Amino acid sequence: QVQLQESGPGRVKPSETLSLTCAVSDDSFGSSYFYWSWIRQAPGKGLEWIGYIAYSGGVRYNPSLSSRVTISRNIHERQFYLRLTSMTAADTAVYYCARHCEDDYGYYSAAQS
Amino acid sequence: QGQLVQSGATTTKPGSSVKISCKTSGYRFNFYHINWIRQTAGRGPEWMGWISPYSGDKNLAPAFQDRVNMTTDTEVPVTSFTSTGAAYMEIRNLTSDDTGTYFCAKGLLRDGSSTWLPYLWGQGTLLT
Amino acid sequence: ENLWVTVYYGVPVWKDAETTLFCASDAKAYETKKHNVWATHCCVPTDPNPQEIHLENVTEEFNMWKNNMVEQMHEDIISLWDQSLKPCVKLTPLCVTLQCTNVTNNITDDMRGELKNCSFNMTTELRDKKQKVYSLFYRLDVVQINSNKEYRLINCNTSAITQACPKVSFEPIPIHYCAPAGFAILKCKDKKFNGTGPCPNVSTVQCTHGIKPVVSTQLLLNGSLAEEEVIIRSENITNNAKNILVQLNTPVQINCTRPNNNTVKSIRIGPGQWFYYTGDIIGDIRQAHCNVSKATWNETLGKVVKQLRKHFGNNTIIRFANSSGGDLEVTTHSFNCGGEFFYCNTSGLFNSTWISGSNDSITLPCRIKQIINMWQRIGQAMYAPPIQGVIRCVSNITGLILTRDGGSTNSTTETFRPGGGDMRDNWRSELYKYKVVKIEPLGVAPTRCKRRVVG
Amino acid sequence: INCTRPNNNTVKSIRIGPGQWFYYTGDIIGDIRQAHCNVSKATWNETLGKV
Amino acid sequence: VFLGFLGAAGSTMGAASMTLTVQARNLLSGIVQQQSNLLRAPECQQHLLKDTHWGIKQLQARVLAVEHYLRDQQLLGIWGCSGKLICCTNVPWNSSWSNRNLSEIWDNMTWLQWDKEISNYTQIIYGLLEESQNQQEKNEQDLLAL
Amino acid sequence: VFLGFLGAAGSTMGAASMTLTVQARNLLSGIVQQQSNLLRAPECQQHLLKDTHWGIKQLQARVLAVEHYLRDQQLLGIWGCSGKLICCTNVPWNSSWSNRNLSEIWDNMTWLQWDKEISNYTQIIYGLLEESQNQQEKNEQDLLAL
Amino acid sequence: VFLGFLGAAGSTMGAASMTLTVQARNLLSGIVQQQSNLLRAPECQQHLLKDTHWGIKQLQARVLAVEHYLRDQQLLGIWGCSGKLICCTNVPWNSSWSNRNLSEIWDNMTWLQWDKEISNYTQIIYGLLEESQNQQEKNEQDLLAL
Ligand SMILES: *[C@@H]1O[C@H](CO)[C@@H](O[C@@H]2O[C@H](CO)[C@@H](O[C@@H]3O[C@H](CO[C@H]4O[C@H](CO[C@H]5O[C@H](CO)[C@@H](O)[C@H](O)[C@@H]5O)[C@@H](O)[C@H](O)[C@@H]4O)[C@@H](O)[C@H](O[C@H]4O[C@H](CO)[C@@H](O)[C@H](O)[C@@H]4O[C@H]4O[C@H](CO)[C@@H](O)[C@H](O)[C@@H]4O)[C@@H]3O)[C@H](O)[C@H]2NC(C)=O)[C@H](O)[C@H]1NC(C)=O
Ligand SMILES: *[C@@H]1O[C@H](CO)[C@@H](O[C@@H]2O[C@H](CO)[C@@H](O[C@@H]3O[C@H](CO[C@H]4O[C@H](CO[C@H]5O[C@H](CO)[C@@H](O)[C@H](O)[C@@H]5O)[C@@H](O)[C@H](O[C@H]5O[C@H](CO)[C@@H](O)[C@H](O)[C@@H]5O)[C@@H]4O)[C@@H](O)[C@H](O[C@H]4O[C@H](CO)[C@@H](O)[C@H](O)[C@@H]4O)[C@@H]3O)[C@H](O)[C@H]2NC(C)=O)[C@H](O)[C@H]1NC(C)=O
Ligand SMILES: *[C@@H]1O[C@H](CO)[C@@H](O[C@@H]2O[C@H](CO)[C@@H](O[C@@H]3O[C@H](CO[C@H]4O[C@H](CO[C@H]5O[C@H](CO)[C@@H](O)[C@H](O)[C@@H]5O)[C@@H](O)[C@H](O[C@H]5O[C@H](CO)[C@@H](O)[C@H](O)[C@@H]5O)[C@@H]4O)[C@@H](O)[C@H](O[C@H]4O[C@H](CO)[C@@H](O)[C@H](O)[C@@H]4O)[C@@H]3O)[C@H](O)[C@H]2NC(C)=O)[C@H](O)[C@H]1NC(C)=O
Ligand SMILES: *[C@@H]1O[C@H](CO)[C@@H](O[C@@H]2O[C@H](CO)[C@@H](O[C@@H]3O[C@H](CO[C@H]4O[C@H](CO[C@H]5O[C@H](CO)[C@@H](O)[C@H](O)[C@@H]5O)[C@@H](O)[C@H](O[C@H]5O[C@H](CO)[C@@H](O)[C@H](O)[C@@H]5O)[C@@H]4O)[C@@H](O)[C@H](O[C@H]4O[C@H](CO)[C@@H](O)[C@H](O)[C@@H]4O)[C@@H]3O)[C@H](O)[C@H]2NC(C)=O)[C@H](O)[C@H]1NC(C)=O
Ligand SMILES: *[C@@H]1O[C@H](CO)[C@@H](O[C@@H]2O[C@H](CO)[C@@H](O[C@@H]3O[C@H](CO[C@H]4O[C@H](CO[C@H]5O[C@H](CO)[C@@H](O)[C@H](O)[C@@H]5O)[C@@H](O)[C@H](O)[C@@H]4O)[C@@H](O)[C@H](O[C@H]4O[C@H](CO)[C@@H](O)[C@H](O)[C@@H]4O)[C@@H]3O)[C@H](O)[C@H]2NC(C)=O)[C@H](O)[C@H]1NC(C)=O
Ligand SMILES: *[C@@H]1O[C@H](CO)[C@@H](O[C@@H]2O[C@H](CO)[C@@H](O[C@@H]3O[C@H](CO[C@H]4O[C@H](CO)[C@@H](O)[C@H](O)[C@@H]4O)[C@@H](O)[C@H](O[C@H]4O[C@H](CO)[C@@H](O)[C@H](O)[C@@H]4O)[C@@H]3O)[C@H](O)[C@H]2NC(C)=O)[C@H](O)[C@H]1NC(C)=O
Ligand SMILES: *[C@@H]1O[C@H](CO)[C@@H](O[C@@H]2O[C@H](CO)[C@@H](O[C@@H]3O[C@H](CO[C@H]4O[C@H](CO)[C@@H](O)[C@H](O)[C@@H]4O)[C@@H](O)[C@H](O[C@H]4O[C@H](CO)[C@@H](O)[C@H](O)[C@@H]4O)[C@@H]3O)[C@H](O)[C@H]2NC(C)=O)[C@H](O)[C@H]1NC(C)=O
Ligand SMILES: *[C@@H]1O[C@H](CO)[C@@H](O[C@@H]2O[C@H](CO)[C@@H](O[C@@H]3O[C@H](CO)[C@@H](O)[C@H](O[C@H]4O[C@H](CO)[C@@H](O)[C@H](O)[C@@H]4O)[C@@H]3O)[C@H](O)[C@H]2NC(C)=O)[C@H](O)[C@H]1NC(C)=O
Ligand SMILES: *[C@@H]1O[C@H](CO)[C@@H](O[C@@H]2O[C@H](CO)[C@@H](O)[C@H](O)[C@H]2NC(C)=O)[C@H](O)[C@H]1NC(C)=O
Ligand SMILES: *[C@@H]1O[C@H](CO)[C@@H](O)[C@H](O)[C@H]1NC(C)=O
């Protein structure tokens, strides 16, 4: 939860592929109704939601970069990854991995975020 | 709390058949009966008949026994205690003396002696 | 004189409630199955005749997404899975390094490195002195950690693994969920009435109908069919956020076969013969597949898009060509058949005029895994034991699980892809008509009568 | 009473069992100080007196 | 002929009040079959309750049902109506709760929408119900202190 | 002098009907000692109920006993006989059930062979017992709708 | 104004006898919140009852409470006082139990020290209470054998 360790190459050449890793510590991964999203922020401008992977499986990405974005989830490895092909100079930004829980039921031991 | 909407008025020459539609809301359409009554211009208004939306049993005045066909559309549920429906009224032989104001009404109570008694009325319609 | 309150005990009054349901097995004892079937052999027998009491005039609000009967059933299935996995053999020492090489696909089959020949320099005890055995592994179960053809089983550095007992069977049997006395199950019997809203037609039951716990991900299998028209279920918001539930009126048929003639090998691991494996295939090397009649599937997809523009309310471009995946469970129709776990390419079913036509019956390639992570969160994985001989199961496809790609493009975009939704949605697909309530039998009303006399 | 362990411990020797299963103490970073606790001498003498 | 369990739930309050025994029975004949444990006596001893907490979990559900019964019988007890299904009291009917006349209530309304209309003042009525008895307790108190 | 628990089981129905309190007590003084948990409070905490499902199993047996009590008190309740051990009803005795006269029944038969002779029609009698009350429910219904 | 649960425990026996409903309520509104399982329905399913025997242990505590209630309602039942909170009997008061006059008892003593003074003869009084009814059983027996 509080320890979302990111790793990968901060240096990518054009026309290549950017792969990034986000590891979770507190094992809230296995809990259902959790959505794990990749988000980038261009400097000076706002933040752009890239894609999200669901508790069942990655449903949707952003329509602008839909064909060039693939979010994977290694269940047992405790991590989830992002891939972005055909890297351009416009994709130069700061990348984050963020978590959020939506419950259709609202039916848990505690309140979620 | 309920409402009884009635179809638009229309004038047709005698000899032909017609149809009045009375749309309901704001209550359980199958709970209360549906009455049809006419206000005669020049004489005393006369009750015409009643029909149960649920039971389907119909009882008409002998003055309109073999001249009227009633039909009740199946109710459409809205709330846990509110539905919507449609009540239809028909006349076979038209004449000039059939001119007058018409109304559709609902029942007061569900059981007891005053079951089919008209309670909530519609706005009314005018004829030929 | 005046008006007085009077107590009434036993009034037909109920309130929405969540209570603990319990299991019930059909009263056949399932003697023709040879072991226990989801450990539901030990479960109260159904009454010979159930009493269903119709409730005239009664209109009650239902919500299949707020029913929670789904969440209860879900936890029950999960816990049963764990209770059946606990006593079985855990393959903790089997994560030794494997020296594996690729073996040729046949010249009648797509040349893939699939079904890898793996030798084990693993020792079980001192007695074994590092015996060398070989086993057949599907490609998905193994990963190439180090080069020079050095391998290990996947997951072994992440978590433990446990082997499904060969005796226990994964076949779903009908389970009637019953409520205790003082609670009740309400059943909406309107066939066309959508999943949620006020039901004009309500009956009460002590136990629900027989619900088969079919494990599925992309398409629903062996469920119950809605009468008259098919049914389409989303939440209220409907805007790229939910998971579309589809219930068909006519079932499609799907036959899935694994032609490979597997055998048994590498028996003793622990003290005594404890582990099953796959010997060399006997006969041809054919890959698993499933046929679906192309005519019937084109008709069914047509009626589906007709009902989509129906519930949508607005003419709009609805495509199926694309499909998107997260993990594996959403790109493939994941399910279970005979004890082997199949994962199928559905792209032929979800394209655009894919037919012509091109086949009498559409065929979908399916790969097979013996390592699965359905309800295995992070910690305990399961090894499905190999099945000797050829495998072939026929399944009713009663439902579907979809997802929209809603996008304010002025009705231009609107694409529906086969999501790989959670298993709870499968329970919602059969619990849409049922609801749990608690009886509040105490009503007080005035009838202007008083107990003047005391004692 | 304030108790502090000044040593800057780390993590090491992770995997023992199948998968990363065990935590341990890396080399300390910075000075080597032993754990301690302070208690105000005035207040503790007053409290012992009232005791 | 008897409409069945909860059959008159959509009927007028008077009609359901005629078949309150029908609703009263489902409190007992759900729990007679489970306490029976006759069909449960032999099936794998006590339905294997070792390493099966669903068995205990099931049992806890049975407990909740008899616990709810005990709540209603306690309320009938403290209102002095234990033996009877219909009892009249001394509490006068405050008109603020509902303004509807008797004919409209008993021949035009169902118990469901009535319980929904009065759920607001149920606690107050129960308080008068627990209080009013207390004047009977006091009359017996006059007979006690002579 | 009192014959003891179930002492008059071989006596005439009249004699057992005189000591029905004796049979009534074993419903409570078996279950007073177990709910007491006074001799159970200290012995290895709660008789080690961890990793001992016999403890839960034992508990389930205690549940069945109080559940059976609740079945009988419910039946006495819905027959309007909650407070009394002997109550008379309005149901007339259909002769098809038994043709024996009163003297032969109460001074020549035991409750065991009587219950065996009438076990065939018990459900029918209970149905009349649940039904007959319904005419009292209806008389109270006449007093309710004024 | 009502002193609250067990409020009149230090009051005279007459004052507590006026607020016995208050003490009667804590038998039910402790056990209404626990049987509710509404705040328990969603919190980690059924409060994780797997590998947690405290959950079963907790449940056994709830069982003891409803079991004690059933003991008191049984005693009120076999004394023919089920429906009432204050009932008079046929048993005469033997003076050996207590020699205190009525005014000294009801306007000078609390229920605690009274129960302590009579705890010696409680079983004897209960025996007369179980016995005395038996003469009512016998009067009904005369009406039975005609
Ligand atoms: C709105 O609410 C109303 C009110 O509740 C709903 O109406 C209810 O609908 C139920 C389902 O349709 C219906 O259930 C019927 O039960 C009857 C009696 O139940 C027993 O029998 C069935 C099997 O029936 C067979 O046996 C009986 C004798 O026991 C025979 O009399 C029948 O003819 C059959 O041979 C068992 O399953 C039960 O467990 C009981 O033992 C049945 O008569 C009836 O069966 C017919 O319909 C079935 C489909 O529902 C069908 O499978 C069955 O074969 C019967 O079909 C007849 O016609 C076909 C025509 O091809 C023919 O081939 C068959 O041979 C047969 O002759 C139902 O099972 C409730 O009784 C009914 N209640 C009321 C008050 O109406 C309504 O559904 C609901 N609707 C909406 C839209 O909201
Ligand atoms: C669900 O909700 C609906 C609400 O819509 C509810 O329907 C109500 O049902 C109650 C009873 O359950 C009704 O209450 C009583 O109805 C008495 C009338 O019943 C007789 O008369 C009906 C009308 O017949 C007229 O028409 C025929 C010509 O067709 C004519 O000859 C008659 O003289 C009369 O003018 C009739 O429908 C009914 O049904 C049988 O008979 C007809 C043929 O007549 C047949 O077609 C039917 O299929 C059926 O076989 C029956 O004949 C009414 O009299 C009574 O008021 C007082 O009178 C009686 C004496 O007769 C007293 O005993 C009684 O105590 C009263 O003091 C009372 O009103 C109510 O009218 C219904 N409301 C409707 C239909 O809107 C359902 O019951 C609800 N169900 C549940 C489970 O909740
Ligand atoms: C198990 O089953 C057996 C069935 O065999 C059952 O035995 C029955 O017991 C009941 C009572 O429990 C009896 O019912 C009543 O009996 C009354 C008679 O009791 C007195 O008279 C007996 C006969 O004595 C005769 O002989 C002597 C000479 O020996 C003579 O002087 C007498 O006048 C008389 O002619 C007698 O056996 C009995 O027992 C005591 O006394 C004798 C000495 O007399 C002594 O030897 C015994 O050891 C014992 O101390 C006693 O003296 C009978 O009168 C009564 O009928 C009406 O009359 C009385 C008034 O006296 C009313 O009060 C009463 O309400 C009646 O209206 C009634 O019949 C029944 O007779 C037995 N049946 C037999 C023995 O076959 C057991 O009780 C059963 N036990 C259980 C637990 O179920
Ligand atoms: C715990 O234990 C204690 C025991 O010490 C117990 O206290 C007893 O409380 C009960 C009632 O709860 C008392 O019993 C009744 O008391 C009636 C008297 O109450 C009135 O009179 C009191 C005396 O006032 C005198 O002095 C003033 C001058 O100051 C003078 O004007 C008066 O005329 C009178 O001479 C008085 O204290 C009391 O309290 C209020 O008023 C005073 C001012 O007067 C004020 O200062 C107080 O703060 C307070 O506001 C009140 O005014 C007594 O009459 C009654 O006897 C019969 O008469 C009445 C009619 O008045 C009948 O209705 C009744 O049924 C009787 O037949 C009876 O004796 C008892 O006296 C107390 N004992 C004491 C104090 O020793 C607590 O209640 C216990 N609590 C619990 C929870 O258990
Ligand atoms: C949706 O519903 C469908 C409904 O059809 C489900 O599909 C069903 O699945 C089940 C379970 O997977 C299947 O049961 C299996 O049937 C097999 C049929 O094999 C036949 O031949 C076998 C070999 O025949 C030879 O031996 C016999 C003696 O045994 C001789 O009489 C014979 O002449 C030959 O010499 C027979 O052994 C068998 O009796 C059949 O006649 C069985 O082989 C199979 O048994 C295996 O699996 C058991 C459970 O794990 C295991 O205990 C056994 O030891 C053995 O390994 C099993 O009984 C249904 O056949 C299948 N229906 C079909 C194909 O129509 C579907 O699973 C369900 N869910 C989903 C998600 O689709
Ligand atoms: C999946 O793959 C397996 C292979 O592992 C197949 O099993 C083999 O099936 C073949 C048949 O196709 C078997 O071969 C035949 O075996 C018969 C039985 O042999 C036993 O019984 C005899 C009689 O008591 C004993 O003497 C003998 O020692 C064995 O114990 C033989 O009778 C057959 O011989 C006859 O037929 C052949 C032609 O088939 C003639 O040429 C011979 O002259 C003779 O007339 C034959 O040998 C083979 O034994 C099976 N393997 C094993 C290990 O048992 C499965 O069938 C396959 N799956 C499916 C569904 O087919
Ligand atoms: C307990 O002990 C641990 C040691 O194991 C301490 O952790 C170390 O803390 C020091 C700071 O005191 C770290 O050193 C500094 O790291 C900064 C971050 O480096 C990361 O980020 C940059 C920017 O992206 C990457 O380029 C880089 O590769 C790393 O990924 C550097 O920015 C610092 O350099 C700057 O400061 C120094 C002076 O401090 C200048 O000389 C440099 O020129 C430059 O301007 C600096 O290197 C050290 O990395 C930490 N160790 C580890 C393993 O991360 C804990 O702080 C200590 N506990 C407490 C409470 O202090
Ligand atoms: C899922 O696919 C399976 C196929 O693998 C399919 O199972 C079969 O369904 C048919 C129904 O069309 C079953 O056949 C019927 O069974 C009933 C029950 O015994 C019989 O009464 C029927 O006989 C009457 O009807 C016939 C016409 O349908 C008449 O010709 C006949 O004379 C009788 O009047 C009929 O035989 C068939 O038994 C099953 N197969 C098996 C193995 O059970 C299933 O229907 C599909 N799922 C769904 C939801 O449809
Ligand atoms: C099932 O259908 C009902 C009825 O169409 C849907 O509920 C409707 O939702 C729309 C949009 O929010 C409202 O305008 C209607 O008033 C609703 N009607 C009723 C009766 O609820 C419901 O959302 C559908 N459920 C699905 C598709 O799962
Ligand atoms: C969309 O639906 C609304 C409501 O049914 C209808 O009025 C409108 O004409 C529709 N528009 C299109 C473009 O389908």
Residue numbers in the entry:
A (entry chain H): 1 to 35, 35A, 35B, 36 to 82, 82A, 82B, 82C, 83 to 100, ...
B (entry chain D): 1 to 52, 52A, 53 to 72, 72A, 72B, 72C, 72D, 72E, ...
C (entry chain G): 32 to 143, 152 to 185, 187 to 309, 312 to 321, 321A, 322 to 397, 409 to 507
D (entry chain G): 294 to 309, 312 to 321, 321A, 322 to 345
E (entry chain B), F (entry chain B), G (entry chain B): 518 to 663
Extract from the study:
Accordingly, we generated the E275K substitution and the resulting trimer, BG505 SOSIP.v4.1 GT1.1, referred to as GT1.1, was expressed successfully in mammalian cells. Thus, GT1.1 priming followed by boosting with BG505 SOSIP or ConM SOSIP selected for at least two different CD4bs-specificities, both of which have the ability to accommodate the N276 glycan and neutralize diverse HIV-1 strains.
We also solved crystal structures of fully glycosylated BG505 SOSIP with 21N13, and of unliganded 21N13 Fab. We determined the crystal structure of 21N13 in complex with BG505 SOSIP. BG505 SOSIP has four glycans immediately neighboring the CD4bs that are removed in GT1.1 to facilitate binding and activation of CD4bs bnAb precursors, i.e. those at N197, N276, N386 and N463 (19). Overall, the crystal structure of 21N13 in complex with BG505 SOSIP was in agreement with the cryo-EM structure in complex with GT1.1 and we did not observe substantive changes in Ab orientation or epitope when comparing the two structures or the bound versus unliganded 21N13. 21N13 contacts two CD4bs glycans present on BG505 SOSIP: N197 with its FWRH3 (82 Å2 BSA) and N276 with its CDRL1 (65 Å2 BSA), while no contacts are visible with N386 and N463. 21N13 does not have a short or flexible CDRL1 for N276 glycan accommodation as is found in VRC01-class Abs. Instead, the steeper approach angle and more helical structure of the CDRL1 of 21N13 prevents steric clashes with the N276 glycan. 21N13 contacts the N197 glycan through the FWRH3 region where a stretch of five residues appears to be mutated from germline “DTSKN” to “NIHER”. Within this stretch, K75EHC directly contacts the N197 glycan, while S74HHC hydrogen bonds with N195Env. Thus, it appears that 21N13 acquired somatic mutations that establish contacts with glycans surrounding the CD4bs, which may have been selected for by exposure to these glycans on the BG505 SOSIP booster immunogen.
